[PDB]
Design a protein around this ligand. Sequence first.
Ligand SMILES: Nc1ncnc2c1ncn2[C@@H]1O[C@H](COP(=O)(O)OP(=O)(O)O)[C@@H](O)[C@H]1O
Ligand SMILES: Nc1ncnc2c1ncn2[C@@H]1O[C@H](COP(=O)(O)OP(=O)(O)O)[C@@H](O)[C@H]1O
Ligand SMILES: Nc1ncnc2c1ncn2[C@@H]1O[C@H](COP(=O)(O)OP(=O)(O)O)[C@@H](O)[C@H]1O
Ligand SMILES: Nc1ncnc2c1ncn2[C@@H]1O[C@H](COP(=O)(O)OP(=O)(O)O)[C@@H](O)[C@H]1O
Ligand SMILES: [Mg+2]
Ligand SMILES: [Mg+2]
Ligand SMILES: [Mg+2]
Lengths: 95, 48, 253, 255, 255, 256, 257
Amino acid sequence: ELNADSIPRLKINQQYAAMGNSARNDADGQFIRSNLQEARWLIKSLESRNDTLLRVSRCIVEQQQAFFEQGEEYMKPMVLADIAQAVEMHESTIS
Amino acid sequence: MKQGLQLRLSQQLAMTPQLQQAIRLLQLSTLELQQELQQALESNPLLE
Amino acid sequence: DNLLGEANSFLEVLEQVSHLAPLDKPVLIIGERGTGKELIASRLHYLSSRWQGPFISLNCAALNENLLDSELFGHEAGAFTGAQKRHPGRFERADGGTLFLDELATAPMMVQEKLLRVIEYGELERVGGSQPLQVNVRLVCATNADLPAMVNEGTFRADLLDRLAFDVVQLPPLRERESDIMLMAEYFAIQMCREIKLPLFPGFTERARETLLNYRWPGNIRELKNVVERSVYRHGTSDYPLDDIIIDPFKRR
Amino acid sequence: KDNLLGEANSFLEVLEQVSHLAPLDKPVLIIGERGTGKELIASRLHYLSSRWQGPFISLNCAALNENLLDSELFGHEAGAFTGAQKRHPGRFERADGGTLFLDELATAPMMVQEKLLRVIEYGELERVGGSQPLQVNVRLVCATNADLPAMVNEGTFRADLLDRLAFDVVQLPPLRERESDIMLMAEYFAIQMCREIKLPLFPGFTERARETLLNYRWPGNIRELKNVVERSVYRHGTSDYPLDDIIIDPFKRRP
Amino acid sequence: KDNLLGEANSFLEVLEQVSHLAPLDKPVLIIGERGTGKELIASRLHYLSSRWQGPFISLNCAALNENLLDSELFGHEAGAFTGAQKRHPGRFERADGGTLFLDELATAPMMVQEKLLRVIEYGELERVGGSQPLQVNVRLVCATNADLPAMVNEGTFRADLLDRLAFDVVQLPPLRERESDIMLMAEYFAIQMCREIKLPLFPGFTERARETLLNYRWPGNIRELKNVVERSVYRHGTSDYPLDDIIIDPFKRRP
Amino acid sequence: EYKDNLLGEANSFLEVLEQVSHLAPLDKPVLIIGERGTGKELIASRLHYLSSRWQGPFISLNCAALNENLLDSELFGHEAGAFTGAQKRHPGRFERADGGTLFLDELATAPMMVQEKLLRVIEYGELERVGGSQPLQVNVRLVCATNADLPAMVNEGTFRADLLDRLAFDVVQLPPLRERESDIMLMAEYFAIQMCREIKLPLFPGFTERARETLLNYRWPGNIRELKNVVERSVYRHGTSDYPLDDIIIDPFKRR
Amino acid sequence: AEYKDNLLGEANSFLEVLEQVSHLAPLDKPVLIIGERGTGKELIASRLHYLSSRWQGPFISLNCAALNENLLDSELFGHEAGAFTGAQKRHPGRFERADGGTLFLDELATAPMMVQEKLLRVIEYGELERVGGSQPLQVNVRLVCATNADLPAMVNEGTFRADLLDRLAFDVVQLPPLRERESDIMLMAEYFAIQMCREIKLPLFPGFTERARETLLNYRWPGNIRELKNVVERSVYRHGTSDYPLDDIIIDPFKRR
Ligand SMILES: Nc1ncnc2c1ncn2[C@@H]1O[C@H](COP(=O)(O)OP(=O)(O)O)[C@@H](O)[C@H]1O
Ligand SMILES: Nc1ncnc2c1ncn2[C@@H]1O[C@H](COP(=O)(O)OP(=O)(O)O)[C@@H](O)[C@H]1O
Ligand SMILES: Nc1ncnc2c1ncn2[C@@H]1O[C@H](COP(=O)(O)OP(=O)(O)O)[C@@H](O)[C@H]1O
Ligand SMILES: Nc1ncnc2c1ncn2[C@@H]1O[C@H](COP(=O)(O)OP(=O)(O)O)[C@@H](O)[C@H]1O
Ligand SMILES: [Mg+2]
Ligand SMILES: [Mg+2]
Ligand SMILES: [Mg+2]
């Protein structure tokens, strides 16, 4: 794991969310819903980061062992576009 | 199956480029991304 | 609902169709030129508890853009404003009500096989909207005089059609209930006279009726209505009865 | 007013049948040789029909390619279109309450014809981007020169659709068959050309010209009359004296 | 006006017929043989036509692709499809009432005639999904290096396409038929070649060359004559050369 | 155990099953000489039961009907090429089950190029792709079945001889419905039980001698399709009848 | 360096062909193989690619008969854009597979005349045909060929142009017939039997019968491929628990009883 322990993986307050869900004021409920949408966006961001890390790890391991065994002087050229194509993700995203 | 410029199929997807998505990428800011996430979580109500 | 032919064999078939209407089993029957079995089944569904449900009938002859699965689930998101005014899809309209299918003989055999597979699985999914389907709403189809020999000939997949319908509606003979066909012709003539603002029915010669028997009505009610309409229009008057019967609209003079 | 020729007794029966068809809003087909002008007859009938002030659609058959109904016929005024989404008018939708004439409908795709017939019989627009299909009171008309009796038997068109598409189909008598409006059309065209070519007057068709016209097979019918007028345009060079032989066949070669 | 007249009786009659038809704006067809030059004759007629101060622009008929026949007929309004660049200039729209001299009419495919069927009607420029068709009466004219009546017998073209020609098909006589200005035409072509070959003067090859041409079939009526003259000049490359032993048989192989 | 579908009591059927078990232990191409309506993946089901990938079921699904261009697309699918978009290897025949055994049917309709692709599949060969290079190599065994004698087609030059030979490593002949005579009664009883279960019928109420005679006189082109139709007709009739009701037959067309 | 496993046989023709392949290995010229069906000409071509090409040179085995649509065959030449339904991404790769390597094909008889002519107009000059509008690439790719039909036979048929047939056939490598080899055939059969015994993971020796050898001699075996040997080894595999098998089945439909 790419420092999975160091990964934040922070989550919103479920108790406060329940309080926002139980908010009597309609405007307060709407604000709580907006905060929940922002929290869902953050969760999606974290999940995307983790997935990108895992995919990059797999793509590297596809050839990293070959480079490690062959040696530094026996290093094959690596293309960012080729790596992205192998991972099938966006090339700019990989860059 | 080699005709050119035939009837165009309806697009069923969008780029949907959002500055939120780019910040989510964070260019893999790592510890910097952690600090930014902490700052946002502080700015985000009912977070952590 | 509306006046319909009442041949004895047709009466038995209508009774069977009404009995089957309460069950939501899929419907797919071959159709003659006159057809009307589809209308009878629709009336039966109206009589059954399936009434007040959706009655989306798509004549499967026009495909827009990719269609196919996109036709099956028309809820497509992206390349738009982010909100769709009304994009339920063929499956969604089929869900919760009767789903009649037409123009199916010319529809792609692969499309039919996929629809039959989805009839059990219900693996509906689309960018705009997805659903596990399995709505259990009754389905109907128009085989359009499909030949089982064609399945044997391989034009259409035999399994794809067999899994679609375990039972079908038989076709009553056109020769049966010839006298009642005269009554239907009279009713249609009265309807046209009301539509054409004609004074009244001037009558019909018995020789013309016998000639109608000779024509044998190849299109059944479909041919009969057109023949009666042509006879009325060529009559152009309601003073005396008509003693001329036109077998075909095409004629030489 | 708009109607032309019609002096024939068979043409009189045709006018009577047109009056009868006016009572019935049901669509019909006009049959005639090349250059018949039965399309103009249908247009004049539509003008004399219930919608005295109404639209008309020329809608030639071979004008839409690789396009469904909602590209030019039904239209895509709604959004969510393929690629870019925008308003797009439709001829079939726009012509409702008017006339939707089909120019040479016999030369249309067979499967597309079947789909169009299925739509028309059902009376539902369907298409995409619309909440309700509704129905259209546009006058559906058709006029060509081909004979459907053979094409349908050959599978060039759907037989059931053709029967449904056929209600009061009538075939006009050939102009060569009539052989009466020859002089009338000749005089009318001579006046029209003399006004057009600024000629002082019609030179006139001599007895030889009349005999040639009588003997003319006239395959083009009214188009053959137009060809006769075109030949007289050469005889306009002979406007000083009566035209001896107005009739000419372009296929033959002079000298 | 930059065309060398045939300066012959048949050529003079053809020019006279062209001048007579010049004010007339009705559709035309040319049945001149191979190497006629009607590509230039019709252009000069358009220069002398009624719309002399009019925008005249011809276009190749068979050149249009099979996929985009509608696009060639009229530019798609870009409401649908991937195209998002408004409406392309339609054929009638590109003509804009001017001369659109049709070349290579014989080689068009069936769909081309199907589109022409609508094009037969006056104006009515209906784009892909447009609001309403526009009337653009443009001077129509055609030519056929092949035999159009023979095509009609074969049925490759449409009968309405035959009806498209409103005037008589002017035909050019064969090079064997005319053989009148062959000497003068050869002299002019030789002068033009010598100007091109950077020779102030050169004895033209006409001694017994007129007899040989009289014995020649000369399929390349206008072209191959000057072509052979220039070829012989290039082969000789000399001015002080008698008009003898000059011949061109490019297809044939010398020993 | 795969529910032991279509348990054929015939000794020839048992020998074919043993041979199929041997082939499933192997991972090499094998030919199944079948006929229409006969052995419709039942042998394939047995092979999956005895497959080396017993835990991971193979793709199977040999039966397929498609156009020539459609079959070619099923062979090679790229996102950019062809009409469909954003889906490369949409068929994914090898992608359906890694290893296992690729299963094919109606190879007679396959074109010469299609037959050549099949041959390259039979040996160690790369994947088919419309564009680019397909160095991707997915090992998977081969299974196929057609109702015709491909020796004649090769003699007629309608299929690649190399494909016909290499594919025909070991032809698995199949018995048709006409072959099954004594086991027909057992198959009928099993179908009756299955229909009674599926149609919620209390049980198989019983057969009639006239019904058995009619079934024997029936051509019965399908090994189970005829049995399936007979069972369906009997279930529909006897469900209301609660009795043998003589013979119930299913006809596409009914008169009088 | 590394040698691919090959069947052992006393076939001086095979050794001479190998020596000729070695001689042409430093050479970079077109090579044509007269291999008939099942002669394993592909294996010989690959062995050449080991030595005839530069070490670790790119190789590609594309059969023109395998081509489905001639439009796709055009797509086999690189398309820049505006081709087919989707012109978003276009990379034929065949020329890329060609670049820095040799070209190997089998049964080049079936090609359309236009395909062969384009192949000539590409190979002889070295430029690459592009389906989309682009400057052609002079990709340095060798060409190796292997077909059953006689080149003069097609010349009489006229399928290959004289220029195309000539520039296509620079060197001739006749593949020895399987029926031609008799003793080498037996030795290769024994070697393939040993390899099959290893593959089947059966410790017991396969064993053979004299009548079986006589029948195999009777068998035409037009294809020298391992496939015919594999069929023989499968006929052996149908027998088990015996040290030396007896008899064999020509075909599974054969001897159905
Ligand atoms: N029993 C009936 N009673 C009244 N009208 C009928 C009857 N059967 C047929 N018709 C008329 O005949 C026509 C047949 O139409 P349709 O069922 O669409 O034919 P098809 O299904 O063969 O296309 C209908 O428009 C209907 O008005
Ligand atoms: N009723 C009529 N009276 C006089 N001329 C007519 C009449 N109908 C048509 N024409 C002439 O015939 C031609 C009409 O051809 P067109 O309208 O294209 O016929 P079609 O019905 O074959 O399409 C014109 O030259 C027109 O003047
Ligand atoms: N009267 C003329 N004077 C000079 N050149 C002519 C004349 N008529 C035709 N040409 C020559 O003919 C050539 C045009 O070919 P053309 O005859 O138009 O072919 P087509 O008739 O098949 O269209 C031109 O190069 C032109 O020089
Ligand atoms: N000398 C040899 N030693 C071992 N195997 C051989 C030999 N010659 C041919 N083969 C075998 O024949 C099989 C097919 O040969 P070939 O006919 O060249 O293939 P292709 O069908 O592509 O032409 C190969 O798998 C190869 O193992
Ligand atoms: Mg119908
Ligand atoms: Mg020219
Ligand atoms: Mg090979």
